[PDB]
Write a protein that binds this ligand. Structure first.
Ligand code: MG
Ligand code: MG
Ligand code: MG
Ligand code: MG
Length: 136
RNA sequence: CGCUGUGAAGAUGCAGUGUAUCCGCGGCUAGACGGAAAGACCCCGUGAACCUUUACUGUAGCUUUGCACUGGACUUUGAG
């Protein structure tokens, strides 16, 4: 399945390269979310008609990513929820309700890639090692 | 009608012979191979059915792997 990219993917992302991928990589991940588009012999024609105005935007969203990742890299924001122990609380210490904790002291910081299986991820080449402290 | 023979081989009907007027009624069941059911036993039909199994050939189901749905990455794995 020949597709051309819109955003850059981690392994094969050249943002417009003729990439041959399994049919399940597209149709289930890339096309629905939006990270690429099928080459229909005209999408590539219309990609150059929009590449000039899109790669500058892609840098701009990337530029805002590092600015936001570095602006709020020194917060020690603490929750006021009831807890039983530092690590074993009455609720759940996870990326489910901390959105309002960081939004009240700066950027909203919508939680989509705050990895915690506190390194928050926001772009392919941008990642911040935030540290969360909770009083218990 | 009986008897003795004969006879598809156990006779009311054939032969010989004996007995015996015609016709009921109440009884009895020895025979009419008495009535009833195209013997069920037995054998046969290149008949049926249902049942069994390590009869044959199949098959539901269960199970194995290939391919599709079906993808990313990292690692132990041959030749270019
Ligand atoms: Mg006689
Ligand atoms: Mg009587
Ligand atoms: Mg009779
Ligand atoms: Mg008969």
């Amino acid at each position: 399945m020949e597709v051309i990219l819109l955003e850059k993917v981690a392994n094969l992302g050249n943002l417009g390269d003729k990439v041959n991928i399994k049919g399940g990589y597209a149709r289930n991940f890339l096309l629905p979310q939006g990270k690429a588009t099928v080459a229909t012999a005209e999408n590539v024609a219309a990609f150059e008609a929009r590449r000039a105005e899109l790669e500058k935007a892609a840098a701009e969203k990337k530029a805002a990513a590092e600015a936001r990742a570095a602006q709020l890299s020194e917060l020690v924001v603490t929750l006021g929820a009831h807890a039983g122990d530092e690590g074993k609380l009455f609720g759940s210490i996870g990326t489910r309700d901390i959105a309002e904790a960081v939004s009240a002291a700066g950027y909203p910081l919508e939680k989509a890639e705050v990895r915690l299986p506190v390194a928050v991820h926001l772009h392919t080449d941008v990642e911040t090692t935030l540290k969360l402290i909770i009083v218990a």
